[PDB]
Every structure is written in structure tokens, then in C-alpha cells.
Amino acid sequence: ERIVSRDIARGYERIPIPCVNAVDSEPCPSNYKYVSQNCVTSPMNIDRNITHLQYCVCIDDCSSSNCMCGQLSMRCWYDKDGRLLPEFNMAEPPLIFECNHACSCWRNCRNRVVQNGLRARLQLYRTRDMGWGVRSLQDIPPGTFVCEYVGELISDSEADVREEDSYLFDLVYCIDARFYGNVSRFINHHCEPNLVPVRVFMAHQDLRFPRIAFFSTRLIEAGEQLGFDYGERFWDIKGSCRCGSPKCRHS
Amino acid sequence: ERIVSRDIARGYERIPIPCVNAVDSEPCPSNYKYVSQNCVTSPMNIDRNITHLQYCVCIDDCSSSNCMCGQLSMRCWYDKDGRLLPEFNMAEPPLIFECNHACSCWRNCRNRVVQNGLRARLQLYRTRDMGWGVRSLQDIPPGTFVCEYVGELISDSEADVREEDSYLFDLDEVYCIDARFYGNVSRFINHHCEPNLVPVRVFMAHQDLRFPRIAFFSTRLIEAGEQLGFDYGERFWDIKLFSCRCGSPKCRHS
Numbered sequence A: 001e002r003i004v005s006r007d008i009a010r011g012y013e014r015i016p017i018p019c020v021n022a023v024d025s026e027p028c029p030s031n032y033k034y035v036s037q038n039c040v041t042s043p044m045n046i047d048r049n050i051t052h053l054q055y056c057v058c059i060d061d062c063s064s065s066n067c068m069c070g071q072l073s074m075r076c077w078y079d080k081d082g083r084l085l086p087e088f089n090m091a092e093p094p095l096i097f098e099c100n101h102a103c104s105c106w107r108n109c110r111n112r113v114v115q116n117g118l119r120a121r122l123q124l125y126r127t128r129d130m131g132w133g134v135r136s137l138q139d140i141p142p143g144t145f146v147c148e149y150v151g152e153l154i155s156d157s158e159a160d161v162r163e164e165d166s167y168l169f170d171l172v173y174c175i176d177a178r179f180y181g182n183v184s185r186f187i188n189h190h191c192e193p194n195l196v197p198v199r200v201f202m203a204h205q206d207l208r209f210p211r212i213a214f215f216s217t218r219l220i221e222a223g224e225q226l227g228f229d230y231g232e233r234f235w236d237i238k239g240s241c242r243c244g245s246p247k248c249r250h251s
Numbered sequence B: 001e002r003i004v005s006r007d008i009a010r011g012y013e014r015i016p017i018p019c020v021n022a023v024d025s026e027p028c029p030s031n032y033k034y035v036s037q038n039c040v041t042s043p044m045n046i047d048r049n050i051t052h053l054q055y056c057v058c059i060d061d062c063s064s065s066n067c068m069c070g071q072l073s074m075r076c077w078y079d080k081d082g083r084l085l086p087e088f089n090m091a092e093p094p095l096i097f098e099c100n101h102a103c104s105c106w107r108n109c110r111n112r113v114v115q116n117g118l119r120a121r122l123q124l125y126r127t128r129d130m131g132w133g134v135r136s137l138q139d140i141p142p143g144t145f146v147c148e149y150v151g152e153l154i155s156d157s158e159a160d161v162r163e164e165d166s167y168l169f170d171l172d173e174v175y176c177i178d179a180r181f182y183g184n185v186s187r188f189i190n191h192h193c194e195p196n197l198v199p200v201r202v203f204m205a206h207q208d209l210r211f212p213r214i215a216f217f218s219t220r221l222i223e224a225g226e227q228l229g230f231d232y233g234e235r236f237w238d239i240k241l242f243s244c245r246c247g248s249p250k251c252r253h254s
Ligand SMILES: Nc1ncnc2c1ncn2[C@@H]1O[C@H](CSCC[C@H](N)C(=O)O)[C@@H](O)[C@H]1O
Pocket: A129, A130, A131, A132, A133, A166, A167, A185, A186, A187, A188, A189, A190, A238, A240, A241, A242, A243
């Protein structure tokens, strides 16, 4: 198992994200630019007017049903360790509105998780069957924020005239992780996924532009490959799945 | 000396900024919203196209003569400790272009200081004569990044129509940072005719030249307890009713 990179993120994450290869002689992928945060090429007129934010007036740690930001989210879904509550609907997730800089609360309040960024020790690695994949180097408990789907924010019109469509996440707007992305660009499709994407609003609340946060759907054991469900639009064009699920819907 | 706030920044800075009042019964200022980064109300079309960034191809920690981002800045002005080189012209500062996310270098490279944020221990306190000032609670060596002037980025024509002009920083199509309604610790810094702070125009995540960010660097050793001051400049005093109270033997606006 060769270490082909000590950190594909080049110090932009809280931890390094190594790339190893125990399978063949492919070096670390280098046909893209690692970015830890979403970027644009042509302008995207995101509403950043600070007076447009809805915000809370809490004097505590935003753990009460009075928090506006929790109400926008239906309730605050976060426990004190930043994990999704057991009652969180993994099959049909709500929008999460995290607290923001217009709010009266402190930066350490309960309702702040995704804005704190990636924490789990993850690793790019060569799979036997589906190119590069990502795995966790540690146990991740259920409902943990794992990573954000980061890339280039583009319009659907711009997406349609792109040659490569394998790194597209639909938000109509898209995140294309082909030329610019983070570690998420490498996560493989799985039919019984250990990650679910959740739409999240933080510094802005322009509803055209959710941020896409992956949360664990169960305990993810150390060494295990990360996967999420690419959804039906992807397979309608890309259809065989090699996830190896007894319940695989696309093989 | 009453402590009237643990931290006026509510945990948004690396360090807390307490407020104390040992002069009167004024409570902690609360007629403004503290923000640790610049904001807008009306849209500012900042060029944020990632392909418009100039960037470097450095294979080291950007400490060599060859750093392209250093070249944009004339040279990189930071030493190993993030302090401005002794050769830095405080009387006529260059534009600084810090490394960005488009550079080939690592996030811990030498050419990254302002983007790392406020680090010095500061305090909002009640002055006897000039209401609310900011002091340092530690010695700050010369050429250290102290704080950024943050507030609401607005056009010159929006600044013209506002009643409160006392928290305006002019940038250089002209734009201003208005810290009246939304600002950080810097909005509380008093004017001084021999200032221990100098504003430097800095570029980080974008290089849209209409929108520099304003970083205050120390002009000399500031000692523990010393009030911060910068020179508001002549435009300000040409308008401003009252005379300067900075108390400098060389005051120019007395
Ligand atoms: N479950 C699966 N079965 C077979 N191939 C898959 C797969 N999930 C992802 N892939 C492959 O990976 C692409 C998605 S991008 C994911 C990272 C990719 N393995 C890489 O090396 O860059 C798909 O278009 C497909 O080629």
C-alpha cells in the first residue's frame, strides 16, 4: 500500500486527507484543483444582503424551541455533540438552517455543525473495481457530519454543455466537482448508502443555493468505504453498478 | 473598572474582546451589530471568478524570491513570524497580495497573515475624553497584524446620502466600508496624529481591485495597555465641529 499523497487538501482541511494505492500503479489524481469551499466561474447572483437573513434572538445556546433557526429547520436536529437526532428523517431529509452572523447567539451555539467544516479522518484510496474511492480511517457514529459536496456552482444550462457529467450534483443549479472539488468528488455510489445528502443554509438563505452536507446514516466502521445514492437521473444515463449490495438496484 | 462584556465578538474571533468601563455608567455598546467579516446590504458585484485569480506555483513555503504572489506585492513583506519586514514603507504601503486557494502552495505558507485573522489580545474600554477606545492588553511587536477594518461595503453614492459619516473607511467607481451599523472591533479605534497603526490594502480570496480589504499593522512596539490609534486622514478632519484630542505633542488637527 503506497502513500501517493500525504494530503490531497494541502492543509485546507482540519486534518490531512492522504491518498494511498494498494491496487495498481496510478499516481494521486491531479486533473482537478482541490478547493475546500464552493467556488464560481461565471457569476452566480447569490443574495448576500445581510438584512435578508432570518435569524434568532436567543440568550442561551439555541437549545430551546424558541430559536427561530430551529423553527426554520422545523426543529434543531442537532444534539450537543453535533449529531443528528434519532428522529431525523434520513429517507426524506428536511432543510437545515444553521445559526448565522445576524443571530444574537454565540459562535459555539448548538445549531452550528456544517459551518465548522470537515472533521473525520478520511482517505482517498484505489478500489479494485470503481477507480478511486473514499474511506473513513475511524469509526463515525450515526448522524455525524462527514463532508460537504464541494465544487463549482453552475447553472443547469452550463451543465448541459459540459462534456463530463460524472461529478455533477443537482441542487435549477448544480455543483460540478470535475475541475474544482473537495474529497467528495471521489465518493462512490452505493445502493444501501452509509451517507445521506442534506440541504443546508448557513451564511446566506438564498433558497436556490443549498449547500450539500453528507451525514452518516449508521455507524461507519474504521476502514469502511463511504458511499451515497447518486439517484435515479444519474443511472437513467449511466446504466452497471458494482456496489456489491445484496439489495443493489442498478447491477 | 466594571467588566461589561466577556466578549463583544460573541466567540467569532480566535480571541475574546472584553469591554470594560472604569470611567462612567455606560453599558457595553449595542447600537450596532458585531460582524467579524465584511458584509453587504445592496449587492456588490465583487469579481469572484476563480479563473481571474493570479496565483503562485511555489514548491516550498513561499519564502523564496520566486513566489509570484510575493511579486504582485513587490516582494512578500512577511517574515517567519507573520511580521512586516523592517524594509516595509509604513509611510507609503504597497498593496499586499496574499496567497489564495488557487495557488499550488499549502495553507500554512509564509504569505498568509491577514487571512488567518485577529490574534492580538484587545479590549474595548471607556476613555475619559473620547468615548470608547480600543487598547492592547499585550505587547505587540512592530509590523504585526492587529485587526482588519470591517463593516458594510457600500458605494461612494450610498455613503454620501447617509447621516452618520463617522465610521466610514474610504477604499480607492469608489467604495467605502461603513462600520456604523455592522462592524468589528476597529469601528471603536480613535484617531491619533502619530498612530501606532497603519492601514494596508490587502487581497486574499479575490483580487477585484475595487474592493481592497483594510488591515491594520503596528507601526512600532505597542505596549500592554496602550490605546490603538490610526490616522483617519485629512478628508475626515476637513469635514469634522470639534478639534483633535489625541494629545500628541505633534498633533496636526488640534
Ligand atoms: N457503484 C458504482 N459502480 C461502478 N462504478 C461506480 C460506482 N460508483 C461510482 N462509480 C464510478 O465513478 C464515477 C463517479 S465519481 C466517483 C469517483 C471515481 N471512482 C473516480 O475514480 O474518480 C462514476 O461515473 C463511475 O465511473
